Design an enzyme around this catalytic site. Sequence first.
Site, PDB file in Angstrom:
ATOM      1  N   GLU A 164       0.656  -1.476  -0.049  1.00 44.86           N
ATOM      2  CA  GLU A 164       0.038   0.044   0.068  1.00 44.86           C
ATOM      3  C   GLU A 164       0.883   1.136   0.029  1.00 44.86           C
ATOM      4  OE1 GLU A 164      -4.100   0.351   1.337  1.00 44.86           O
ATOM      5  OE2 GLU A 164      -3.615  -0.957   3.140  1.00 44.86           O
ATOM      6  N   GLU A 365      -5.410  -8.586   2.879  1.00 43.16           N
ATOM      7  CA  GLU A 365      -5.665  -8.224   4.192  1.00 43.16           C
ATOM      8  C   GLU A 365      -7.105  -7.868   4.350  1.00 43.16           C
ATOM      9  OE1 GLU A 365      -3.304  -4.793   5.960  1.00 43.16           O
ATOM     10  OE2 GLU A 365      -1.821  -5.648   4.827  1.00 43.16           O
TER      11      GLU A 365
END
Length: 461
Positions: A164, A365
């Site tokens: 990310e 996730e």
Amino acid sequence: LAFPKEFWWGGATSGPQSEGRFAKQHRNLFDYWYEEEPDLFYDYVGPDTASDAYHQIESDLTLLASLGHNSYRTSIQWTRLIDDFEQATINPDGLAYYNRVIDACLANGIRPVINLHHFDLPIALYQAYGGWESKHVVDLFVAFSKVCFEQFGDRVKDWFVHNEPMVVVEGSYLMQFHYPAIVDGKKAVQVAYNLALATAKVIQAYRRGPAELSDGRIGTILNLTPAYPASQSEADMAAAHFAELWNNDLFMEAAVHGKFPEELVAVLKKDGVLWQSTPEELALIAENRVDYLGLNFYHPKRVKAPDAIPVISPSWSPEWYYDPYLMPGRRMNVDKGWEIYPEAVYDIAIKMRDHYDNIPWFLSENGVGISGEDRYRDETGQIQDDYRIQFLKEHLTYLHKGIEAGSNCFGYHVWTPIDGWSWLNAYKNRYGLVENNIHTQVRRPKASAYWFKKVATHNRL
């Protein structure tokens, strides 16, 4: 409800959040930050011990296989593996630590999944060069990654360049939750660019290595959560549309399509904030696209047209073009001030299907953080985290609908197997399938772990 054959099941963590700084030669941005300002960390717990995986990795992995996991994702710390950054020399101890990690996966029949960068730029690199602001550093990161490919590509067939990178862009140069925690749109945007560049350069390097070390897949770990507009008005709609170009599309388009989004570039130019590039650079990026992706999702995002348009700005900020929006009646996680809305996973699945070529991706996730888990122990001492079960279940359900609908999703990872250290929040909120007592480092499976074992072992709900 049944999943494809070969579906990844397991959870995700990172080097900086699980290991502890034992024997670690260098300091990453967070390690430095904690030594300087330990008051910024919940209960003053920094990353020195974290969840003790530097010692306990082998027994952790045994516990996880006995809990049904077939894969595991963690990260290799630049600041542990590399002695001299400039030449990417190898620290033997670092090297022996990660081999223990790889070998212990295989040994327990757990596909090893490896991320190369999880918010853990070496502080010395920020000090000398401005870190990700510098294309030199990008080269050093590229060199670091060849070492990993060389040393681990024999056993590791599943690589991801960043976790990310927009969170790095934001935390470091926009919202003050990574060091250096400065506000500077111009630096934000360039750093976005460099992270995207790094990604293509790393993918290039991976793919040049000898057959036996380059027959795996490589990609990156992004976000695709929609920005739901407050209404269907045209001003709210334009707000959401921008929120996605910045938050989702910038990195998604670079990784999947070889290009940055035009609309986004035009806004950045019109705002004198566009990044310095090089046609040679843009082509490396066109030439090196991901084999696959991980998308992380914890909460939806919701936007409206800005209440206030300012004529002068201290700094540039994508938040010019939108404001957060709360939806009356939405379900929420109080501990974290986050909306719970699992339907979004379906939307993420469809968005991959119709707008990123249905390339394979996994949910890398998914998890929920709660803060007083001691309140839910039963008379056996075990945490009865029924809330975690319901959450994971609902999100998994929608992921299923997304697959059933044609989306090329091959896996689901829970953040996180064992309670880990969550940056400034440290151990405030726990996310683990397995409890960890940060004093004794004793792990202990919560109800959620046994529910997840049942799901994983039978490949279904």
